[PDB]
Amino acid sequence: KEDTIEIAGFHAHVYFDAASRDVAARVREGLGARFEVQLGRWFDKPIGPHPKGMYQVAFLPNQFDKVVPWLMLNREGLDILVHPETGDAVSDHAVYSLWLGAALALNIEFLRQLS
Amino acid sequence: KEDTIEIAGFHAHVYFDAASRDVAARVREGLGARFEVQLGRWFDKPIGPHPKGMYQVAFLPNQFDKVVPWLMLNREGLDILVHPETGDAVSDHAVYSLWLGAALALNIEFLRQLS
Ligand SMILES: [Zn+2]
Ligand SMILES: [Zn+2]
């Protein structure tokens, strides 16, 4: 087994489209109002491994049981990837992650090409 | 918004088949060794909403950031449903849940029929 100590933090990637952008904005405000998070920039186009528009929500491990359960209940149909940050981008995204909603295929090759 | 106070606990459903049953047994032992959990019966065949053999793992909310990150890292390719317990069985499984690995298709109507 590896040790969960090796998790330094998590990212949630909240995916959206034109039809769900407004929902995504409300979820973002909810997160920023409630939790100890760093909100990344809003990407309206796919970038890197990300198959659709998204924004990033970063947090330390002590917010995992705050943010993730909140999103379980309040994501309003949005597909959300949550992954640990362990120093292995490819596994972090492809193996060690979870999904709220319906998983989307990621461009993991983008991450492989970086390593 | 929905209040995560309304989350009384969580279940993990660890799915397996004959090929993966031994990995599932090892994951099960890892859980029972490390965390405050209630391990339910082993179902080799599909039962109720579940489309594959599984076993249940129950825990209080204070284990969510222990159990779930551990499974993130140590599920060894098993598909795992994690759902809250909020007193709404249909929403808990269908809407409020998350998946590690690749999601399976649950029989939600089975739960609706329960009322
Ligand atoms: Zn990320
Ligand atoms: Zn359950």
* B7 in contact with chain A, both atoms CB, cutoff 8 A: yes
From chain A, the residues in CB contact with B98 under 8 A are: 68, 72, 82, 98-100
Superfamily of domain A1-115 in the CATH hierarchy = DOPA-like domains (3.30.70.1240)
What does the alpha-carbon distance between residue A7 and residue B91 come to, in Å, rounded to a whole number? 30
CA angle A25, A86, A76 (to 5 degrees): 25
Q: Which two tokens stand for residue B41?
A: 């019966």
Contact yes or no for B100/B71 (Cβ under 8 A): yes
Obtained via which technique? X-ray
What does the alpha-carbon distance between residue B20 and residue B44 come to, in Å, rounded to a whole number? 11
- Give the resolution in Å: 1.5
What does the alpha-carbon distance between residue B114 and residue B112 come to, in Å, rounded to a whole number? 5
Quick check: B73 and A64 CB within 8 A?
no
Buried b (16+ CB within 10 A) or exposed e, B96-111: bbbbbbebbebeeeeb
Q: Which two tokens stand for residue B45?
A: 């065949």
Please tell me the number of Cα atoms within 13 Å of A35 on its side-chain side.
Answer: 25
DSSP letter assigned to residue B38: E
Closest CA to B15 of B71, B70, B53, B47: B53
**Residues 50-79, chain A: which have Cβ within 8 Å of B?**
61-62, 64-66, 68-70, 72-74
What does the alpha-carbon distance between residue A38 and residue A31 come to, in Å, rounded to a whole number? 10
The domain locations on chain A are: 1-115
Contact yes or no for A4/B70 (Cβ under 8 A): yes
The gap from C-alpha B27 to its chain's centroid, in whole angstroms, comes to 13
Closest CA to B34 of B4, B74, B3: B74
DSSP letter assigned to residue A43: B
